[PDB]
Design a protein around this ligand. Sequence first.
Ligand code: NA
Length: 129
Amino acid sequence: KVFGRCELAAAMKRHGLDNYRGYSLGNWVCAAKFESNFNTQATNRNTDGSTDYGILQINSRWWCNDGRTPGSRNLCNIPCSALLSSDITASVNCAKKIVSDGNGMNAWVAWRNRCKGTDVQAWIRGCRL
Ligand code: NA
């Protein structure tokens, strides 16, 4: 599923991401735009051979199991395929564990490089939330 911007903002808010660990909703929408272009089915191979899955490009090195990432963990206890569903529950639940790991949203390099310190409220502008 390719989410609309406000559609994804509504879904993230309903799932309790708005101001989760102090990160306003626009931070999460911005991260999703540059990780996935709001596409739940997005997959990208990392140089280390792990893969990033779904709207928030969650990494098989630590967070989900894809059966092909040697020496990796599955700290969200989910098959990586669950991160590609039209229903973002698994992605959101897993993102809550990631952002709680100590480095906040710096875990998402695209957030650090493209969203951090920017006018992230623009990402929820015009949305009925
Ligand atoms: Na894994």
